[PDB]
């Protein structure tokens, strides 16, 4: 090594959108238990492996003195709330303004699984994303689809800068 690496992530997003279930589906394979509260816990640990090397995130649920530490964003959307996605603008104008000059950054539009209720195509969130020169997946905390995904490829492009300088 024998470097150690702790990355501070970020949840954010409107109310509503699935912060809190795509945090406990990534750090506890849950999802809507009833044997776990969440109440109010602020953040959760993962370990991941890249490279060899054991990656500890510690991932942040919900102005500078807020995005203090942060080294990664996961911006969350719901594909079911158009409102939420609208609103994306507005949490990259704040990050822009309060966030680390080069925190890497993240677009997750969330419940894809629920394709009978989706407000925001696939295609608007691709097209937004590429917009801002931003990373974008599609996720469900329901159906584990790109939630690991998500992490990791934040945590590589974390990463890789770090092993830069
Ligand atoms: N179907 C589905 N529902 C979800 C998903 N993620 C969150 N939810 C539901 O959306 C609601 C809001 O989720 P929550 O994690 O509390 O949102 P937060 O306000 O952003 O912390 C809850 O009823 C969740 O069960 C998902 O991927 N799929
Ligand atoms: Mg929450």
Do not use: P, Q, W
């Given at each position: 090594?024998?470097?150690?690496?702790?990355?501070?992530?970020?949840?954010?997003?409107?109310?509503?959108?699935?912060?809190?279930?795509?945090?406990?589906?990534?750090?506890?394979?849950?999802?809507?238990?009833?044997?776990?509260?969440?109440?109010?816990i602020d953040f959760k640990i993962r370990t991941i492996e890249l490279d060899g090397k054991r990656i500890k995130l510690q991932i942040w649920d919900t102005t500078t003195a807020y995005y203090r530490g942060?080294?990664?964003?996961?911006?969350?959307?719901?594909?079911?709330?158009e409102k939420s996605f609208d609103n994306i603008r507005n949490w990259i104008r704040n990050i822009e303004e309060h966030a680390s000059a080069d925190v890497e950054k993240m677009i997750l539009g969330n419940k894809c699984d629920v394709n009978d209720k989706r407000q925001v195509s696939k295609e608007r969130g691709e097209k937004l994303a590429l917009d801002y020169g931003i990373?974008?997946?599609?996720?469900?905390?329901?159906?584990?689809?790109?939630?690991?995904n998500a992490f990791?490829?934040?945590?590589?492009?974390?990463?890789?800068?770090?092993?830069?300088?």
């Open positions: 090594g024998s470097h150690d690496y702790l990355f501070k992530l970020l949840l954010i997003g409107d109310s509503g959108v699935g912060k809190t279930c795509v945090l406990f589906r990534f750090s506890e394979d849950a999802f809507n238990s009833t044997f776990i509260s969440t109440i109010g942060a080294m990664g964003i996961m911006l969350v959307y719901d594909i079911t709330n990373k974008f997946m599609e996720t469900s905390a329901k159906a584990n689809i790109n939630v690991e990791f490829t934040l945590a590589r492009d974390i990463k890789a800068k770090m092993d830069k300088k």
